[PDB]
Amino acid sequence: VGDKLVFLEALERRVYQATRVAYPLIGNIDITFIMPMGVFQANSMDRY
Amino acid sequence: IAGLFNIPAGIIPTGNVLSTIEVCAHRCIFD
């Protein structure tokens, strides 16, 4: 990749196989959302 | 009912089994 020679590893069968431990790299991402509910644009030009 | 033969019954095994995975996750197929 690029201009280098790197190892590529996907260890899930040699390690973390048939054990009782979770495999990392499956972390979570928290995302919030925001929505207005009852706004009313008080103007005569935008209520078209 | 089962259990008439010894459960370990250490003898010369017939053949080795593969796919070492979590067997407790599904035990309904077993008797």
Report whether B21 contacts B27 (CB < 8 A).
no
Residue with tokens 């033969």: B5
Q: Take residue A26 and report the two structure tokens written for it.
A: 């499956």
Report whether A12 contacts A23 (CB < 8 A).
yes
CA distance A47 to B23: 65
Q: Which residues of B touch A17 (CB under 8 A)?
A: 20-21
Solving technique: cryo-EM
CA distance B24 to A20: 11
Q: Which residues of B touch A18 (CB under 8 A)?
A: 20-22
Vertex A22: Cα angle to A17 and A25 (nearest 5): 105
Dihedral of the CA atoms B26, B6, A17, B20 (nearest 10)?
-90
CA distance A18 to B22: 5
Rounded CA Rg of chain A? 26
